[PDB]
């Protein structure tokens, strides 16, 4: 189900923020287990020394959808890996398209 390479696992929002900061590469991203919201994943993104987090959860239809800023419809993907692949291009309702996968101890 959770077939993601950039899955740090159970890490506080601070850890994910410090991780991207250390990288120093825009477009970088990772995954974290929302503490306040158990069961939901958060996709962090590096941009101008910032960490944008998006709500990624699996619906009852077995699909993965991302929740971004208003005015942007949430696309439904069949696989979680397909989500990250779609965010690898402009025009996706985000601050910046992924460009530097923050591998979890596999760089």
């Amino acid at each position: 189900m959770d077939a993601v390479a950039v899955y740090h696992g159970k890490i506080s929002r601070e850890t994910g923020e410090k991780l991207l900061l250390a990288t120093g590469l825009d477009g970088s991203y990772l995954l974290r287990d929302s503490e306040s919201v158990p069961g939901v994943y958060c996709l962090c993104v590096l941009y101008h020394g910032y960490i944008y987090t998006y709500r990624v959860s699996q619906t009852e239809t077995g699909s993965w959808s991302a929740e971004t800023a208003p005015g942007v419809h949430k696309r439904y993907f069949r696989k979680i890996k397909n989500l990250i692949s779609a965010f690898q291009k402009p025009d996706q309702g985000i601050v910046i398209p992924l460009q530097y996968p923050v591998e979890k101890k596999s760089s």
Binding site: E17, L20, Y50, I51, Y52, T53, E67, A69, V95
Partner: peptide, 8 residues
Amino acid sequence: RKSLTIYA
């Protein structure tokens, strides 16, 4: 230190 997270 301040706020490196912005969420969405």
